[PDB]
RNA sequence: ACCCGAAACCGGUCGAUCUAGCCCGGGGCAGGGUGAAGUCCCUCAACCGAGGGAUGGAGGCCCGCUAGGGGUGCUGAUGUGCAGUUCGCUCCCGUGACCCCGGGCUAGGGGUGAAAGGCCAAUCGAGGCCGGAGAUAGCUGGUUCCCGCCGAAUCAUCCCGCAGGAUGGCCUCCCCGGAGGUAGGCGGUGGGGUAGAGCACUGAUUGGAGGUGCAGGGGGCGAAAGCCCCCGGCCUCCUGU
RNA sequence: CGGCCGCCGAGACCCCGGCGCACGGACCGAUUGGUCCGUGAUCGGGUAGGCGGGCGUGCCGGUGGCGUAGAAGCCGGGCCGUAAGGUCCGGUGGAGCCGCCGGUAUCGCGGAUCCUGCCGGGAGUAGCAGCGUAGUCGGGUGAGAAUCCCGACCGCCGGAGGGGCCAGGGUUCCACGGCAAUGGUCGUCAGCCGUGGGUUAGUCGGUCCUAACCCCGCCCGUAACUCGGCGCGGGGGAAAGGGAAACGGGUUUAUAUUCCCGUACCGCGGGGGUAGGUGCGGCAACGCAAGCCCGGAGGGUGACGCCUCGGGGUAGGCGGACCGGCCGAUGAGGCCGGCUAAGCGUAUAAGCCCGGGGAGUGCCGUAAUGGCGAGAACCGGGUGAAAGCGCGAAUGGCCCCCCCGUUAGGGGGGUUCCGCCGAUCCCUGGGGCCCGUGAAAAGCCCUCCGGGAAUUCCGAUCCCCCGCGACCGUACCGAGAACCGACACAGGUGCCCCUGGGUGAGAAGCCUAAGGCGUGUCGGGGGAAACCCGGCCGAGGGAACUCGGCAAACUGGCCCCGUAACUUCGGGAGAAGGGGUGCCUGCGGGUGCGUAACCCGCAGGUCGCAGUGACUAGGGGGGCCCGACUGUUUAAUAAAAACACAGGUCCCAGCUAGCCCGAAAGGGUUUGUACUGGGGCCGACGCCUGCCCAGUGCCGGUAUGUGAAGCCCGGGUACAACCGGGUGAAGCACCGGUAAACGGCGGGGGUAACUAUAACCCUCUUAAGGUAGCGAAAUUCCUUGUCGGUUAAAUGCCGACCUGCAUGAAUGGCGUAACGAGGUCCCCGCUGUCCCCGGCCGGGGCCCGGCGAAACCUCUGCCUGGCGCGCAUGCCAGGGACCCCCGGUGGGAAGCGAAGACCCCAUGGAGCUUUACUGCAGCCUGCCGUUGCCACACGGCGGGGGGUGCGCAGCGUAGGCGGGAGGCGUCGAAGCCCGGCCUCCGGGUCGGGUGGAGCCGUCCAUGAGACACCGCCCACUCCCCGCUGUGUGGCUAACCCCCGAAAGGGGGGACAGCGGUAGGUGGGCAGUUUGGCUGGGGCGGCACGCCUCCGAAAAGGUAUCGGAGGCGCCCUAAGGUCGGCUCAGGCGGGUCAGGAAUCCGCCGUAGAGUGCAAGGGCAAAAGCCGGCCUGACUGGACCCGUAACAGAGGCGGGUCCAGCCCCGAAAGGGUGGCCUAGCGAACCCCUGUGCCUCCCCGGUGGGGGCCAGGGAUGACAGAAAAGCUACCCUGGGGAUAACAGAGUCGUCUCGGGCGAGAGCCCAUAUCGACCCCGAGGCUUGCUACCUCGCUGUCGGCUCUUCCCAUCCUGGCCCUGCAGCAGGGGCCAAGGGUGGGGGUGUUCACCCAUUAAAGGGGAACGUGAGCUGGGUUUAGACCGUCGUGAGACAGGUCGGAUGCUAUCUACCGGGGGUGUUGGCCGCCUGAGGGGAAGGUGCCCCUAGUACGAGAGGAACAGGGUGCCGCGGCCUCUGGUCUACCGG
RNA sequence: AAUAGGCGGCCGUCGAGGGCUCGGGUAGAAGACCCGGU
């Protein structure tokens, strides 16, 4: 048989590679040595549209002379001042350790471990809810609905990511979809395994139906995991 | 291993000037129409409202031999062509998912695919070049001077055997051994169950006569113990197979 | 037909002569032999094949020779040899060659669709047309001119055939000298040949920067590398991105932004001054020369998308005036020239600012959006582009005039204004859009920070002057001849960048200026045809054509009225439909200063057939199916209903995740983080999406069973191997969820008979029985279902019903506006599609002069009937034909372009699928190592100790056996009391104390007796020590992950990762298998291993998918022996007792029985009944059968020897079943037995060997093993199917014999049962004889011909024939046998006419004649079947038709010979051809014959239509590229 | 028409008759055919 699209994506060819040269750059926090035990004040210079981010970006210049790129929270104003550190006030756009953030607050850009630079709640329109604070861990409810425990020293930014409601308007046109997916080099348009040939897909065949149940085992080898992978259930409930 | 021919398999290499996809940087698309959002104006009334007039340039919008791109029908010309896919008329898109160019990347069980098993240099249900390699076949074709002597077979058993082999039968050449041999006929000693014929067994087969109540059936007939016939069955004989 | 006579006729038979062969004999050879004689009626064909001899070729060892007085070789002849061949003669040739003996070898050719080279017929033929049809006249050159050169005329392109210039080409560029070859002809010409030349840069480009991306070093992986890779350091990477600087005139045969002249600019360095160091004007925006050098930082610029509009400007264009020139008539008018580069200096517009000012019952402004106390009107100013203006620059260029003109030259004039339009070319601002955000760096400018030098000094971005500026490209084409495609290729690259006037909206079409060309290169002739390609027209009809309106035709621009169903309210829509359109004269209006330019109206006059007059330029409407739309696809037969799409919904994943690449290292998603990344399915929109978890999947659990290695325990082994048990993860077993997961959603009877028929209803049945919708459907076989509409006529289309073979709800159901080169039906209009074809034009065809092939070719080439491998130009018998050439049409050569589309075979392949076989990755998991430290719990071990033992009986709560009736007691005991304790709360054990001297049987009970004492245990449990693991909790120090250059910090953590091993899962990836026979193959069956009867033909043998049946066991008796008896059936007689229970007598040849089929054999037995036994045994020999003759592994059977036995008195018998079926190699393993053996020797454990028995291969003389191919490939097969031929005729079509009868009587007017005999090859089938290195299918169109079994026309006979008509039959093949509807249809059905509207053959006639609707590839949909790939003689949409005629054939046209010398003219007609004619109707006979009436003929006599044929242009119509007019 | 014909006329034992060339169609693909040519 022939390879699948997922199999061909793992080889890193330009058909599947992300065009990470037209983007504004990675959004990570300043190194943790600056933030620990000290509070830094920065000024917002500009708010721009990152080609592939699903969220606006902002440029922040700090008093020590460091220029950084951050994910702009909703309501962030050009020329406003922000603070990062343990002593930062509780306001939108300020970054604090999770131990100093009061319960019931909305946060985003949470570090998985202290100093990694931020890994969670980064998409546009997303926020997480601080639930409980303990000397050993801090519980936050993530956008997926899961309650996750983080180290008290993990950093997060107060507010909600700008760009929410993006899915309220339909894409309408295949041309609109074409531009949207070409901006980030995502495989588009997409074919169907049932209309593929038998050599190409497990579901391929002259008759456009799957010849086997579409729920595939978690232990299936690569080149076989298609359809519903390790599905607990199917259908509409 | 007498000689030539396979489709195919395997190794290492060569190709994205064709074409497919994606990235960086560039060039291009006469003229006309329609009239979305938006911004309004005027009149009569005023508790409602009704009517009229503008501006505005959006669209995978419309007409279009602009350029450029595509290829529906004629199943037209040509069909040892101008051309190893071209020409004419007709037709379709023509501001967009648009067309084209220079620089790059993805390489063969791999790439790429708006998915036709399409495209990857006139080659694609696994590219090309050299090597394994003079590959293999029970299948097709071929196999070069003359005279002389003898001269077949397509029948039995076995094989994943049925277009192929092996053991025998039938042919030919040479040698040992040394007195019998038998294709034809006559007479004799034995064996046989075919043709024909026949009913003595086994099984069929038309009618009639006699015997047998014979566990049969049909009627009449009787409290009930059984009778009277017809038919049927079973034997013998005659008759026709 | 019954006989005879004579002849003729083979290689047969006879005779003479010759050869060889086989055998025997004599004689003679220094290697197979030679000569001669004898016999051959009993020797003489020959494929496969065997054997013997001989001929020829190259070279070696010998031997004997030839040759320049002519070797080899070659050409024509003579002789010899059966022959393969040898040798001579004549000629050419000029240098080597041969006989014999013995060796040796790339040793002998007609084939292999053989290889290489050369040459024929096709052929002096095709081609030199189609998309741009271009030449003519006079002159010149030259041996030579359609083709070369000049002038004139006539033409083509003119948003490209013109101008510029990349890539590519590499000298093709220029001049001179030429035509052997090249150039589609010629050539004096050339992109050709020869000889000489040609490319000049500080400013143009490379060079510099960086983008996507690439390379090198370190590092890591790999057995390793030239292989893979993250991170660090370095470098490269654009001749169209960024990026210092030049523009006119002139010059050469060929270079010029490069050379010369003129005028400039840029970078570096230097010299002399100056500004500044130490300076001013403005409130301000700002104006300014506004210090030098080194280092750093900041800002700006470089620096950016798409759509759209306003403003300013420039090229270019138009009109007018004026001066020169040309034309015109020295009229009017038209045409030509009237030009201005960089650089330097110079400023406004928009935009943005800066002062003053202080508004709203609001003012201000734009094309538009808009702005204002967060500061508007309004008055001043600052900065700020493209341009214009001045110098450059009129000594230059352009135009004109004059003198000299033999060559060569010299001078004089002008080059000026106004108005309008105006870019796609520049500058500058608004506005709008993004789920889309549309590059970086070098470089340059400014500002700011530190540092350095400067006072009789430092010193510029300002002025003047001077010097230097490297390397490489530069010619030419740039394409219908300079590139790629083999080409001077109609393709592609590059149309990549640019465009005067008129008409016109237009970069449209047409004409035309400039520029270019006549080289999209063979010319000439012609009523010079037929026919083909391209174009124009066509009377009357108007789709009657056809699968289908294919093609063509109608409409057409603009203005004004007007515009439907439906709808997603946007659309449909230019729906539909109607009116007008030219020219001239004159007015009015809009913007405008304008009587400049553009645009919009009005009135009148007038001409034609026609006024968007050419050119340009929609035909329209109504239903249905499918897909929402724009878009994409099989480059080269399918553009679609297929794919994509926005939208819906489901699944996985919190990041060291999920999914994926890899051998690993590392990596893609990822500069990402659930509004995200990845994985399915449906597919806009509207309404909806029902039931089922039994099956197959997936997910969770897993108490319990199984479950590998490892570990532990016992046995074994002087140690192991080996055996048994325990622990035992994952996975299965099991349980639960899950269907927008794969799929499924049934089946019988009767009813409610206010008829009949329906579901209310009761019985099996599953996980459940299909809900809403839709339905003869792209799904319906019957089917052309039935009804209604459409037509004269309907296999169509639409509406409806439901009997849904085999619809149905996200493999979605139904509906749907808009959309579509999708399929489909109808209507108006239109037309040469058709009736029915006829004219005209241009190019071919044809002839003449040139260049000049190819496909193909065994040799040839006439027919009828035949034989034949079954459809012959060549054979047999006949018929006919003198020979050659030109033009044409394609019947045949099963013509040419191919080692068969289709089918079968091959122990041949490839792609794909799966619960086929066997494997490899990935994934899950146990164990060992990395791997450490604190505790807790649990499960097993060793050392000890505890309480805890109701079987039934009892003083009593005996568990087991042993010694053992006494043992205990100050070595302190009963009977009293409370405490803890286990406990079947039965009832026992025990600390303390009142207590100070007794307690149990032994005896009997108890299936087994002592709480008499002494011992070992067994059943549960706990605890003290040590060992062992499993799980749980915690820790950091290994290890990992993050931040950081590092230091170090943080997070996880003995997990994970890595290494080794063990089990599972695993079409993700591979190698394979999927048998054979077969009246093709498949399905079926097993004729695939055995036994019996028939076939089978009286010895033996004998086959078929021949006929009739059995076997894959069973029996300790159904085996051995001995003794005794006689069976089945029937008759007669008997208590219950009968048809049948038991008994007596007789007949009784087996009619019974013998285990099981059939055949054979069995009567004092081989049957039945009894006694005794195991010979169904051990060691061996020979023989028969499977398998004749005639080969055999294995197996079966028979005759015996010996041992030990059985029965019998003995003889005698017994090696299974009375005989013929009931079964199986190698290797391996198990068992019995008693011997041999294992590497220097010996012992032990273990292994190997010899003999016997057993476990099975049924495809049974012994592989381990599923499918699709329509994407298919290869080698083959007429050993083998489909089409066609051949054989046959069951079947089909058509007859005949007899006569039961039916016909009022009457068999035969007509029909003719039941039976019987035939003909044809027109239906189908059967066989498999020709054809698989290809013979192209059905239907239709065109065209020719034949048969009669006659539909009509001609003539007759019978009749249940009155007439008109009918029914049946006979002769007769000259003629006719037509037009339409649905359907691909043949056929069949239907419609209106007709004399009738016949059936058949010709390779189911006819594709080198056509068409391509069906069938039968590759794409796609629906239904059904299959787990799946997929399949369906089931529907449905699309899906290629090649040709230069060699021979013959036919149609026409010519040159010759012959016809006993040549020529002209007129005739004859032997033979051949014809249909040259065929057939309706009307009047009259006649309302007559006939007939009751109704009705209704015929002979004869007249007229006329249609079909067919042969002619003609007076009449009519068509055309009329002569001609005339608008 | 292989029995390959009949008749009238002109010619031979220099010469009747004909062809090319010429002007044109009652004809035509080349050939052929038909009229005219002092």
Radius of gyration, taken over Cα atoms and rounded to an integer in Å = 22 Å
Major sheet details: 6 strands, antiparallel
Quick one: overall form?
Answer: elongated
Regarding quaternary structure, what we see is: part of a larger assembly
Strand percentage, roughly? 15-25%
Distance between the termini: 37 Å
**What is the strand arrangement across the widest sheet?**
5-10-6-7-8-9
Structural class: mainly beta
- How many beta-strand runs? 12
Number of helical regions = 3
Q: Which sequence of SSEs, written as H and E, runs from N to C?
A: HHEEEEEEEEEEHEE
Roughly what percent helix?
under 10%
PDB class: ribosome
Keywords: RNA modification, cryo-EM, ribosome
Entry title: Structure of P. furiosus 70S ribosome grown at 95 degC
Name: Large ribosomal subunit protein uL2
Can you describe this structure?
This protein starts with a helix and ends in an 8-residue tail after the last strand. It contains 3 helices and 12 strands; from the N terminus they run ααββββββββββαββ. With 237 residues, the protein is mostly beta strands. The strands form 3 sheets. It has a 6-stranded antiparallel sheet with strand order 5-10-6-7-8-9, with no helix packed on it. Strand 2 and strand 3 form a beta hairpin. The protein has helices at residues 5-9, 32-35, 174-184; strands spanning 40-49, 56-62, 67-71, 81-84, 95-97, 106-108, 128-133, 138-141, 147-150, 155-158, 215-216, 228-229. 8% of the residues lie in helices and 23% in strands. The structure holds 3 RNA strands.
């Amino acid at each position: 048989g022939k390879s699948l699209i997922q199999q061909r994506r793992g080889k890193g060819s330009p058909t599947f590679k992300s065009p990470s040269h037209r983007f504004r750059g990675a959004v990570k926090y300043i190194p943790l040595n600056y933030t620990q035990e000290k509070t830094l004040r920065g000024v917002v210079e500009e708010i721009m549209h990152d080609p592939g981010r699903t969220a606006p970006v902002a440029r922040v210049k700090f008093e020590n002379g460091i220029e950084k790129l951050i994910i702009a929270p909703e309501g962030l104003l050009v020329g406003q001042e922000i603070y990062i550190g343990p002593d930062a006030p509780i306001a939108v756009g300020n970054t604090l350790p999770l131990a100093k953030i009061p319960e019931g607050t909305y946060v985003y850009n949470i570090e998985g471990i202290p100093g990694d630079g931020g890994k969670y709640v980064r998409a546009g329109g997303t926020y997480a809810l601080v639930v409980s604070r303990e000397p050993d861990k801090v519980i936050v409810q993530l956008p997926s609905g899961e309650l996750k425990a983080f180290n008290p020293m993990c950093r997060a930014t107060i507010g909600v990511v700008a760009g929410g409601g993006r899915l309220e308007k339909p894409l309408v046109k295949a041309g609109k979809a074409y531009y949207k997916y070409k901006a980030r080099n995502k495989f588009w348009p997409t074919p169907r395994g049932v209309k593929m040939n038998a050599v190409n897909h497990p579901f391929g065949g002259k008759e456009h139906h799957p010849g086997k149940p579409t729920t595939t085992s978690r232990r299936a080898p690569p080149g076989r995991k298609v359809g519903h992978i390790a599905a607990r259930r199917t259908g509409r409930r």
